Amino acid sequence: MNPKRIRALKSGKQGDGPVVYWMSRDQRAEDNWALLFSRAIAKEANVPVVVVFCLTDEFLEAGIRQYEFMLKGLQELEVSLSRKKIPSFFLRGDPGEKISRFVKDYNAGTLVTDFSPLRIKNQWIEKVISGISIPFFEVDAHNVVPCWEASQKHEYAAHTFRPKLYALLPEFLEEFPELEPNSVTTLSDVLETGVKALLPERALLKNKDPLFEPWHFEPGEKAAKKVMESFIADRLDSYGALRNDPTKNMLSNLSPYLHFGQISSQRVVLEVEKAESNPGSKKAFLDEILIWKEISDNFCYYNPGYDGFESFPSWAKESLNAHRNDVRSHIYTLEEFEAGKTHDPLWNASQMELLSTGKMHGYTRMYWAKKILEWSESPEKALEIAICLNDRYELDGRDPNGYAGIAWSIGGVHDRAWGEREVTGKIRYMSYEGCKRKFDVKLYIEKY
């Protein structure tokens, strides 16, 4: 149990009651670091361990596709904690007052939470810190190597981040010890009154039919593992060659589970490394889930304006500035972008998959975002529209990987300089003709 995963947020007088785990990002009972040290603090100090979840008031900022996915997984989570004699308490409201009152009411001893580099998580931390006197600990339960330990600076490329991370797997890539149960110590209602609030804003087709199709991804910790096992057994070997083909379902399809923390990324890395497949296919998968996933946490942790034009590289910021008011071929508003009413059928098909399935293919996720920069009056508007569409309709949205992906597509973050072109500038360019030579585009639009 490496202590480098644990960092101190506020020092105080150790309390008396149960050690409270404030779960935010890693919604799982197994392979969850944050629970293990919470039990370790509960084992080496002889106190009960409890888990507290906050149903915040920003859920209406998204759709019912994310709300119902998260609550269904929470339903499975709390029955797994009951089997370990670990009670789970769910609060409705802003964590700044909910967490502080819970600690005082239950006389909690030490408060522990998992790590998330998002601005919203930080906002909740400051309010909680000012309202509590018990020790406050935080742990990186989402990354194989701690975000502050992989690097203490913003990495400008995957070229420089890869050797740094790859030098610390032997230190941190280790197996998970079993969850020790406590010695001795409704979700359906909140879901019902919840969806009744997001119902009038549900995405719909013309006549009356909701566009979302919820049978593609079953939520829950148990369902996440089955997706992982199916990916290793059936899609690992062909991943390297079929990574960039949207017409084939050769991806791991684990992003909604990883974003909600229903499955640990370290468990995925452990199973894939022990699995035997094509070496190029394996190295391609490990790069995506280790290098590119954890560099997004670094990007958001060391760039406060990660969702702004200020976080772009200097070469890119100058390049788009020289091409700021170049006469755009098309200019589409947010609603035209949202409903999929552009002149590009390939982009329209990408939005259709986003609207219907809630998870758009990774290769088209790069064409989709970069094309917004083409048909936006300014790069700031383009960054804006991409974030709004991503965080609203993506099951894996509102994630550090999302903002790093948008920054990569629009601002060239973690990329390099390419051929200068109008409007887009020096940013990497993806053309519709270029996609025709890479995969069968006609099949993509036909399906969506």
Ligand X SMILES: Cc1cc2nc3c(=O)[nH]c(=O)nc-3n(C[C@H](O)[C@H](O)[C@H](O)COP(=O)(O)OP(=O)(O)OC[C@H]3O[C@@H](n4cnc5c(N)ncnc54)[C@H](O)[C@@H]3O)c2cc1C
Using CB under 6 A, pick the residue from 288, 302, 317, 417 that binds ligand X.
Answer: 288
Encoded tokens for 259: 């974003």
Q: How far is the CB of 222 from Na ion (least distance, A)?
A: 37
Was 32 annotated as part of a binding site? Answer: no
- Determine, following the binding rule CB under 5 A, whether residue 297 of this chain makes contact with Na ion: no
Q: Report how far residue 186's alpha carbon sits from residue 132's, in angstroms, rounded to the nearest whole number.
A: 27
| Residue closest to ligand X (Cβ) | 405
- Determine, following the binding rule CB under 6 A, whether residue 149 of this chain makes contact with ligand X: no
- Determine, following the binding rule CB under 5 A, whether residue 307 of this chain makes contact with Na ion: no
Using CB under 6 A, pick the residue from 111, 352, 369, 389 that binds ligand X.
Answer: 369
Match 């906050």 to its residue by tokens.
54
- Determine, following the binding rule CB under 6 A, whether residue 289 of this chain makes contact with ligand X: yes
Q: Are 323 and 425 in contact (CB under 8 A)?
A: yes
Looking at beta carbons, which pairs linking 360-365 to residues 24 or more positions away fall under 8 Å?
360/394, 361/246, 361/251, 362/243, 362/244, 362/251, 363/243, 363/244, 363/245, 363/246, 363/438, 363/439, 364/246, 364/444, 365/405
Q: How far is the CB of 284 from ligand X (least distance, A)?
A: 8
Was 325 annotated as part of a binding site? Answer: no
Q: Report how far residue 285's alpha carbon sits from residue 272's, in angstroms, rounded to the nearest whole number.
A: 9
Q: Report how far residue 391's alpha carbon sits from residue 412's, in angstroms, rounded to the nearest whole number.
A: 20
**Interface pattern 314-353 for ligand X (x via CB under 6 A):** ----------------------------------------
Partner touching 384 among ligand X, Na ion, none, CB below 5 to 8 Å by kind: Na ion
Was 365 annotated as part of a binding site? Answer: yes
- Determine, following the binding rule CB under 6 A, whether residue 258 of this chain makes contact with ligand X: yes
- Determine, following the binding rule CB under 5 A, whether residue 391 of this chain makes contact with Na ion: no
Match 């009744």 to its residue by tokens.
196
CA separation, residue 364 to residues 157, 293, 425, 435 (Å): 22, 18, 21, 9
Was 253 annotated as part of a binding site? Answer: yes
Element (H, E) at 21: strand 19-23
Q: How far is the CB of 268 from ligand X (least distance, A)?
A: 8
Was 255 annotated as part of a binding site? Answer: yes
Count CB-CB contacts under 10 A for residue 412. 24
6-10 and 136-139 strand pairing: antiparallel
CA-only gyration radius of the chain, Å = 22
Q: How far is the CB of 194 from ligand X (least distance, A)?
A: 21
Nearer Cβ to ligand X (128/406): 406
- Determine, following the binding rule CB under 6 A, whether residue 366 of this chain makes contact with ligand X: yes
Partner touching 362 among ligand X, Na ion, none, CB below 5 to 8 Å by kind: ligand X
Nearer Cβ to Na ion (76/384): 384
What is the number of alpha carbons within 13 Å of residue 82 lying toward its C-beta? 7
Partner touching 402 among Na ion, ligand X, none, CB below 5 to 8 Å by kind: ligand X
Using CB under 5 A, pick the residue from 31, 384, 391, 399 that binds Na ion.
Answer: 384
Residues 374-403 that bind ligand X (CB under 6 A): 390, 394, 396-397, 399, 401-402
Using CB under 6 A, pick the residue from 176, 292, 302, 418 that binds ligand X.
Answer: 292
Q: Are 408 and 297 in contact (CB under 8 A)?
A: no
Q: Report how far residue 11's alpha carbon sits from residue 111's, in angstroms, rounded to the nearest whole number.
A: 11
Bridge partners of residue 89, in order along the sequence: 52
Q: Report how far residue 155's alpha carbon sits from residue 138's, in angstroms, rounded to the nearest whole number.
A: 23
Q: How far is the CB of 437 from ligand X (least distance, A)?
A: 21
Q: Which stretch binds Na ion (CB under 5 A): 21-29, 77-85, 316-324, 381-389?
A: 381-389
Tell me the one-letter amino acid at 77: L
Q: Which stretch binds ligand X (CB under 6 A): 79-87, 97-105, 119-127, 405-413?
A: 405-413
Strand extents, DSSP E, 43-194: 49-55, 88-92, 111-114, 136-139
Nearer Cβ to Na ion (123/329): 123
φ and ψ at 16, to 5 degrees?
Answer: -125, -35
- Determine, following the binding rule CB under 5 A, whether residue 76 of this chain makes contact with Na ion: no
Residues 406-435 that bind ligand X (CB under 6 A): 406, 408-409
- Determine, following the binding rule CB under 6 A, whether residue 296 of this chain makes contact with ligand X: yes
Q: Are 63 and 159 in contact (CB under 8 A)?
A: no
DSSP per-residue codes, 156-180: S-HHHHHHHHHTSHHHH--PPPPPP
- Determine, following the binding rule CB under 5 A, whether residue 138 of this chain makes contact with Na ion: no
Annotated binding site for FAD: 239, 252-255, 288, 359, 365, 390, 396, 401
Q: Which residues bind ligand X (CB under 6 A)?
A: 251-255, 258-259, 288-289, 292-293, 296, 362, 365-366, 369, 390, 394, 396-397, 399, 401-402, 404-406, 408-409
Annotated binding site: 239, 252-255, 288, 359, 365, 390, 396, 401
